[PDB]
Amino acid sequence: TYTLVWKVWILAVTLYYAIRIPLTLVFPSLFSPLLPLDILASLALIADIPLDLAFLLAPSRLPDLLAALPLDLLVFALHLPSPLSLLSLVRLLKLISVQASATRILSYRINPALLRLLSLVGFILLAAHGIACGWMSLQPPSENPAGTRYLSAFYWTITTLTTIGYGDITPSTPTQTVYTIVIELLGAAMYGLVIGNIASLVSKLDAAKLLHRERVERVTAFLSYKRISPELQRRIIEYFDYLWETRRGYEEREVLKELPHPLRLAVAMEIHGDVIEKVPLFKGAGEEFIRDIILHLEPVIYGPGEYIIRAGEMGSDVYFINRGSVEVLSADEKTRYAILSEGQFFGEMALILRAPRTATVRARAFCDLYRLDKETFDRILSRYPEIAAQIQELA
Amino acid sequence: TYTLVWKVWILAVTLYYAIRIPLTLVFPSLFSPLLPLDILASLALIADIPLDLAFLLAPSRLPDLLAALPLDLLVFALHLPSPLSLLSLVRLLKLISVQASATRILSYRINPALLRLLSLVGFILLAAHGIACGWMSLQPPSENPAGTRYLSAFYWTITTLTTIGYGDITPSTPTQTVYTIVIELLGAAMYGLVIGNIASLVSKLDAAKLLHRERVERVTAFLSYKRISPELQRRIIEYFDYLWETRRGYEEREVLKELPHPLRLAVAMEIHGDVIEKVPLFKGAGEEFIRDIILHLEPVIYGPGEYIIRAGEMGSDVYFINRGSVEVLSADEKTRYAILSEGQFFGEMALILRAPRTATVRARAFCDLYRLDKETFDRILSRYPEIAAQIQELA
Amino acid sequence: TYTLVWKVWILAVTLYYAIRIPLTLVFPSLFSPLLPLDILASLALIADIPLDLAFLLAPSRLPDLLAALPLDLLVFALHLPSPLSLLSLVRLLKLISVQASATRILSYRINPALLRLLSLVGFILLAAHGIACGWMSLQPPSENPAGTRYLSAFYWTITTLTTIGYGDITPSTPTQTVYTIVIELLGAAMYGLVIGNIASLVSKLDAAKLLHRERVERVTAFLSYKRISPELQRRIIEYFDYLWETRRGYEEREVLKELPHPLRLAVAMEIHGDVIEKVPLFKGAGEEFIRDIILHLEPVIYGPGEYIIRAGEMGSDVYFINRGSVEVLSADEKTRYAILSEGQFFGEMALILRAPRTATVRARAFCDLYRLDKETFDRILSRYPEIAAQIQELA
Amino acid sequence: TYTLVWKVWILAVTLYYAIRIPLTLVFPSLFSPLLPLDILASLALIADIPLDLAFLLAPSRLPDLLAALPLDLLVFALHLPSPLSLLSLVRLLKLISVQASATRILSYRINPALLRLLSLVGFILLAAHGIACGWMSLQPPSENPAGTRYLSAFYWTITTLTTIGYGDITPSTPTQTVYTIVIELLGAAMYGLVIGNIASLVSKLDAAKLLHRERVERVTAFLSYKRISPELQRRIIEYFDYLWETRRGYEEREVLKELPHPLRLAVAMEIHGDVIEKVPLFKGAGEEFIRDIILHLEPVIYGPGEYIIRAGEMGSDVYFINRGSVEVLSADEKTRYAILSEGQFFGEMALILRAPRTATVRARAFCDLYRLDKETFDRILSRYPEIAAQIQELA
Ligand SMILES: Nc1ncnc2c1ncn2[C@@H]1O[C@@H]2COP(=O)(O)O[C@H]2[C@H]1O
Ligand SMILES: Nc1ncnc2c1ncn2[C@@H]1O[C@@H]2COP(=O)(O)O[C@H]2[C@H]1O
Ligand SMILES: Nc1ncnc2c1ncn2[C@@H]1O[C@@H]2COP(=O)(O)O[C@H]2[C@H]1O
Ligand SMILES: Nc1ncnc2c1ncn2[C@@H]1O[C@@H]2COP(=O)(O)O[C@H]2[C@H]1O
């Protein structure tokens, strides 16, 4: 964590130069009662490229050593004229490296479209400070206090970069006019960048909700063209509502394919944990049979009142309840045998042989259950002859 | 619905404080002939966190009880000085909860990109009121009527937040200059948010139309490279036109997979309702045979004049007409036997055996019909031996 | 086409009212030497809801009959005061219907994102005219000419709706201040709409190019991680370049699935037209064999210098050249047997039996050829016993 | 490269006319000491449509010959009045062709969304020059120097097109007011275009990162609903972190399908180069067996500590290590037999027969290995009987 606390320190130094240099270029009466601080900052900025190396002349390393040799403490100490001392701003090249560090250490828990906006706003304010100092530099010599004429310059630059333009402070000289033109263009560019960043950030703020909305609209639009009843359309709408309320509309089978096989098996083993550990025919088997079965359970959701099994039909599947309730009724739907809930299973008689069903099965709410076929079971039983022999015994 | 009519009430109270507090901070002559109303609002705002609980110190519950204890009726009653009475605006924190409620009760029948825009516009106007009151507060003491100087302040704040900047009202004091700078930045930020929200809302307004347009452009671009006739390109274009006119370009097979199996079966059973309930060989069968067949019918669209069956060839399919018309012609296309329309079927002789066809079949318009193979029929007939035996009898 | 020439007429009438009404409300000296025109327009606007019916009280029909009864010719003829004659602008509701017509008759050959922008710009200019008339109405009575004070009003409204705000024309009265505030908000909203529409239009202007660029970047990014030679990366890059130059990067197999089966068969029959009509073993067969084969040819592209067939190996495929050239070399690549070009084929000996190859085959440029397997050929030959018998004879 | 150096020359000529023509229309005292240059430019611009032809009256060729005949050197030489000499700007139509060339020669190594922005900025500055000259033309006759009144005009046009509007330079005449209105509209349009282009460019700057972020958020959102342990969620998160760090989240199987078969085979042969060239049972085989095997190896990633093979189970696969390390332990995980690293393989005994495993295999870090089944091996061995016979010998 020492790296983190030293990066904050070098940031606090490059934002010390980024506020002191342009403001010293305008007021030379400074730089005397801040020399103990700029010596310290120069030391703490020159003894940082070794440490970075312990982690030359490269396309992404030139700023770090260009912003480290003391161009300052020389132009201010020797009192160089105006055109040649303006290279004292080479220390601000360190800001590039600072940004390049902050865009890769903090980019784990922050939206990449918001960190860019925060960096842009910080750069805009830090450039507005320099623009205010520049505007204040090329003004007629006056006797006003330093803070009043800094306030006027900052007011002018803020009213120019936001494209408001009150007009109470205007150029009065060719040089001021050229400066105003160039920084009018700069302000337009910066405001355009801000608007574009905000538009990008807002445009991608509700993705799952809009995807679910449009895939419901598409289904309803196609479904009305085929002239299907209002009742069944209402059932479909309420199913989509339940899907959005529970799992935000994500499809289980397309979600559980971005995982590699061992993680997918671990997830499946923690989901279908206890359910298959109590099935009367799978007992006596090893862990490889169970692990083979668990990967072939297929999910399906049944709404309220829907039929799962009809009494009399052949049937070949077996169902495991996960997150719902189920009722068992006779062939006439008049006598209720029992009620099954999470963790239990029904239909285990179909795997043994293809005898017709013996009772009717009705969903009481949204069931969210898993099912296993018979051909899949036969294929994955043809490899474990001892188990298949035992099943033949029970048959 | 009582919850809905009480949420509107608490909204009408938090927009009563949001208009009365900043305007009372400027004009102290108020708060005497509005005390019966603010007592009532304070009661109706303190007796709302129990009811919310009947539905503490949580990250999303702190505003509700911070905006409920009467910081008002104390600063105004005891006449606290300017810097310390400004915490009377804690009641405006209730606006967060109000927004958080309106974004989850009304988010069922409203585009999520439009509710955010409406909330943003409401917040912008409600903040412009407060900014106008703030600007009017730090002005020199004058004798003008209260409404004229409220009109001037509102005019200034509206001409600043829209980034127009006429310039007839400008700062004339350091404090006014600092206030103007900060709210120039606020106005730029708000206008950027508005533009970004509008851009996001507009960018996603024609999705199906643009998707259809680009998937037609891609087909034509690829299709010209292979040097294919203008006639067949015109046929493809008119097919895509018909598809867009009828079902907005949605593909039937990719649409009918977002449904679970029972809903998909219900949809198919209501689509292919009567058609298979009159087929001469499927009669005598149960409901499971029909329900098995219905899930294996495959859609296909035939344009005008196209050939569906050629006289003499082997053939193995059977076709059910859904939304079109069909004509039956002899081997020489000279004598018209009959005309079939919606609900009827042809080609049933191919399922029994592989004898060559007996007549030619021509589409009269866009047919939009369903078809069943023979290998699929054989696979799904190998499980119902009684039916297969009867088919063997008819063969 | 008479409908098209009459819709233009009703557009020219609703843009006659949309320019005459607000300008007459300000200058009452008009409406005398334009009565023969507004009578004609009223007739041509009342005798248009029957014709629309030949193509009441509906949610999308109320404007058509609200904008048809003569509220005009009554307020101007009886000289109604200012607050009550302002309902003369009900005729501008016809603009909604006009827009609703122009958005569905011209929406076939125009980008839907550009028609909306053109409509928005037209509405903005037509509203700016009315705003200028409104501003000119509530001004002090002056003696200036009508065109000079219309020019000043139009200048003010254009400098307000574009958010420029020069400030040389400003309010000077409470009513003018309220008007200015409301239309400052209107101008901000309109400029936001314009910017959002332009952003949407520009954001979707190069789709295929960006898709190809990103799918090349993804391939190269993954391909460098596996540490694969610069030569083969250059070959992949030049293959993608050739694909983009010829068919804009579109994949043949994913393109040729948006067509229904008869159109897909027609496309395939026009592509592989002559090639299979000269193959020595397929001769003597009917049209159904050819039509069955044509649907199972699979495309593949070979770059320059690549090997297609190695002398000595078993091999099972047959290749048809479509858009390239091929050379045939001996086992030592020293003696060049022959050169094949578009329309010819090689490898036909593999279908008869699985004898080893007899010569080497090299691509001379990007070949763009089609291939047929052997198992597919065997499956689709097992249904036509006469042909399979003849092949057995040649074997 | 001569074409490249001549296109730069014609660009430097069309940006010579684009700066000289409007500035000469205002100051007639020019055009005498620049005739040797405009004669040269006219020659170098008329002798460029033959060379373009060596690479008429076409929809995309009309500018090239409209901007080549000397409308200049005639209006300036004969001193034509103001309304008729304004067609001297036909030479600026050459800018269209120049842009149309620069958008297709430099569009290989530049983002298409950035070249458009650079072209737009260049056009905006070049139009601002002309707008400044136009504004300076219709001003009262003054005695000021030419550069001061060019500076004022450029200042006015820049403060108008950026929508700032200081207001210190304003119209003072009907013609100036009309000019100001039209170019206020132009400036609003240009600023809207700039903002839209910037928004489009920024909106698509982090695609892979956002895709990875959202596909991790979807997995975690679905994964919490099933109530799965924090440990396994942490394992999934760290797996996704490793995937992003190594290959930017790209899936190997969906990446390696955009290549044609020969390039895919070349890539696979360079990846699995040495590994299969040392396998004890595959030795003695030819190149076609290896080339057949290499296309059926399937990738899989194992995290640290995960189990790859359990001692005692049947097993049927064989694994090749690519970019990781593996340890071999006994049945009790107490004695470490050996350590395998990149280039080696384990599990080769399962292909010979289905005997149970003999040792446990544990990942030490993220392994990134390839695996081969047994049924696939059996299918692709049933075609090479000599190899299958040798395997039967070793079995
Ligand atoms: N009395 C009962 N209590 C609970 N479940 C039952 C009862 N009778 C039948 N079932 C279940 O209902 C199923 C319907 O027929 P199956 O042959 O699929 O197997 C049956 C059992 O799983
Ligand atoms: N006279 C007829 N009227 C209606 N349909 C017919 C007639 N003759 C043949 N068909 C249908 O046309 C089909 C063409 O040959 P099939 O063997 O497919 O079965 C035939 C019947 O379905
Ligand atoms: N002399 C030749 N001229 C043209 N093509 C040939 C010649 N010899 C062989 N081929 C083709 O090259 C193929 C290579 O071996 P096949 O058995 O696939 O069948 C061969 C023919 O199609
Ligand atoms: N002593 C050993 N050193 C290295 N690898 C081994 C050793 N013993 C077994 N293995 C490998 O571990 C595998 C586990 O059982 P298999 O039958 O798959 O084949 C085995 C060999 O590939």
On whether the CB atoms of residues C339 and C367 are closer than 8 A, the answer is no
A357 lines ligand 1 (CB under 6 A): yes
Q: Do D195 and A195 touch (CB under 8 A)?
A: yes
Minimal CA separation from C195 to chain A, in Å: 10
Q: What is the CA radius of gyration of chain C?
A: 37
Q: Residue for token digits 């859904």?
A: B322
Chain C residue numbers with beta carbons less than 8 Å from the beta carbon of D167 are: 165-168
* Minimal Cβ distance to D200: which of C166, C191, C199: C199
Distance C363 CA to ligand 3 centre (A): 14
B325-329/B336-341 β-pairing: antiparallel
**B93-123: burial string, b at 16+ Cβ within 10 Å, e else:** bbbbbbbeebeeeeeeeebebeebbeebeee
Residue among B327, B333, B348, B349 to mutate when testing ligand 2 (max atoms within 8 A of CB) = B349
Q: Residue for token digits 């009550």?
A: C84
| DSSP, residue by residue, B46-96 | HTTHHHHH-----TTTHHHHHTTS-STTTHHHHT--TTTGGGGGGGGGHHH
**Burial (0-12, 13-18, 19+ Cβ within 10 Å), C196:** buried
| B281 alpha-carbon distance from chain centroid | 46
Distance A307 CA to ligand 1 centre (A): 14
Distance B349 CA to ligand 2 centre (A): 8
Method by which this entry was solved:
cryo-EM
> What is d(CA B266, CA B235) in angstroms, rounded to the nearest whole number?
35
Q: What resolution in angstrom units was achieved for this structure? A: 2.9
Residue D304 tokens, joined: 């640290």
Close Cβ partners of C192 (under 8 Å, ≥ 6 residues apart): B191, B194, B195, B198
Chain B residue numbers with beta carbons less than 8 Å from the beta carbon of C203 are: 203
Residue C240 tokens, joined: 């993608």
Q: Which residue of B has its CA nearest to C383?
A: B314
Close Cβ partners of B241 (under 8 Å, ≥ 6 residues apart): none
| DSSP, residue by residue, B131-179 | HHHHHHHTS----S-HHHHHHHHHHHHHHHHTT----SS---SHHHHHH
What Cα–Cα distance (Å) separates residue B347 from each residue in A49, B273, B350, C287, C293?
Answer: 83, 19, 6, 20, 24
Residue A186 tokens, joined: 């700069």
> What is d(CA D26, CA D14) in angstroms, rounded to the nearest whole number?
19
DSSP bridge pairs for B336: B329
Task: Name the amino acid, one letter, at A314.
Answer: M
> What is d(CA B359, CA C4) in angstroms, rounded to the nearest whole number?
45
Q: Do D263 and C148 touch (CB under 8 A)?
A: no
- C170 — contact with chain B (CB < 8 Å)? yes
* Minimal Cβ distance to B199: which of D163, D167, D199: D199
- A4 — contact with chain C (CB < 8 Å)? no
On whether the CB atoms of residues C119 and C103 are closer than 8 A, the answer is yes
> What is d(CA A244, CA A247) in angstroms, rounded to the nearest whole number?
6
> What is d(CA D308, CA B160) in angstroms, rounded to the nearest whole number?
67
On whether the CB atoms of residues B30 and B23 are closer than 8 A, the answer is yes
Q: Do C184 and B164 touch (CB under 8 A)?
A: yes
Question: Residues B358, B362, B366, CA angle at the centre, nearest 5°?
Answer: 145
Residue B115 tokens, joined: 């509710």
Distance C278 CA to ligand 3 centre (A): 16
On whether the CB atoms of residues A314 and A358 are closer than 8 A, the answer is no
Chain B residue numbers with beta carbons less than 8 Å from the beta carbon of C170 are: 166, 168
Ligand nearest to the CA of B356: 2
Q: Give, using CA atoms, the residue closest to atom 8 of ligand 3.
A: C359
Close Cβ partners of B139 (under 8 Å, ≥ 6 residues apart): B149
Q: What is the DSSP letter of C346?
A: E
| C51 alpha-carbon distance from chain centroid | 32
Q: Do A165 and D168 touch (CB under 8 A)?
A: no
Question: Counting every residue, how long is chain A?
Answer: 395
On whether the CB atoms of residues B350 and B318 are closer than 8 A, the answer is yes
- Of C90, C100, C98, C99, which is closest to residue C69 (Cα–Cα)? C90
Residue among D307, D325, D337, D371 to mutate when testing ligand 4 (max atoms within 8 A of CB) = D337
Q: Residue for token digits 């700062």?
A: B171
On whether the CB atoms of residues B135 and B23 are closer than 8 A, the answer is no
Ligand nearest to the CA of A309: 1
> What is d(CA B160, CA D134) in angstroms, rounded to the nearest whole number?
32
- A389 — contact with chain C (CB < 8 Å)? no
Give the number of the atom of ligand 3 that is nearest the alpha carbon of residue C356: 17
Close Cβ partners of A394 (under 8 Å, ≥ 6 residues apart): A281, A352
Close Cβ partners of C236 (under 8 Å, ≥ 6 residues apart): C219, C220, C223, D259, D263
Minimal CA separation from A310 to chain D, in Å: 30
| DSSP, residue by residue, C239-260 | HHHHHHHHHTT--HHHHTTSS-
Q: Which residue of C has its CA nearest to D251?
A: C222
- A395 — contact with chain D (CB < 8 Å)? no
- D192 — contact with chain B (CB < 8 Å)? no
On whether the CB atoms of residues C167 and A167 are closer than 8 A, the answer is yes
Q: Residue for token digits 């203008």?
A: B230
What Cα–Cα distance (Å) separates residue D286 from each residue in D106, D281, D384?
Answer: 48, 12, 10
**Burial (0-12, 13-18, 19+ Cβ within 10 Å), D121:** middle
Close Cβ partners of C21 (under 8 Å, ≥ 6 residues apart): C72, C88, C89, C91, C92
Ligand nearest to the CA of C357: 3
Task: Name the amino acid, one letter, at B198.
Answer: I
Close Cβ partners of A255 (under 8 Å, ≥ 6 residues apart): D218, D219, D222
Chain B, 306 to 365: residues with Cβ < 8 Å from chain A are none
On whether the CB atoms of residues B199 and B162 are closer than 8 A, the answer is no
Chain D residue numbers with beta carbons less than 8 Å from the beta carbon of B195 are: 195
Minimal CA separation from A169 to chain B, in Å: 10
Question: Which among C104, C114, C166, C181 is the top mutation candidate for probing chain B, defined by the most B β-carbons within 10 Å of its own β-carbon?
Answer: C181
> What is d(CA D330, CA D361) in angstroms, rounded to the nearest whole number?
9
Give start and end residues of each alpha helix (H) in chain C: 2-26, 35-46, 49-53, 62-66, 75-78, 94-105, 112-137, 146-161, 174-203, 208-225, 230-247, 252-255, 261-271, 287-294, 349-352, 375-381, 385-394
Q: Give, using CA atoms, the residue closest to atom 20 of ligand 2.
A: B347
- A162 — contact with chain B (CB < 8 Å)? yes
Minimal CA separation from D277 to chain C, in Å: 18
**Burial (0-12, 13-18, 19+ Cβ within 10 Å), D2:** exposed
Q: What is the DSSP letter of C160?
A: H
What Cα–Cα distance (Å) separates residue B126 from each residue in B87, B119, B132, C45, C344?
Answer: 18, 10, 10, 44, 78
Minimal CA separation from B102 to chain A, in Å: 16
> What is d(CA B312, CA B296) in angstroms, rounded to the nearest whole number?
27
Q: Residue for token digits 């009669």?
A: B283
Distance A345 CA to ligand 1 centre (A): 9
Q: Give, using CA atoms, the residue closest to atom 10 of ligand 2.
A: B359
Minimal CA separation from D222 to chain A, in Å: 6
| Residue B322: strand, helix, or coil | coil
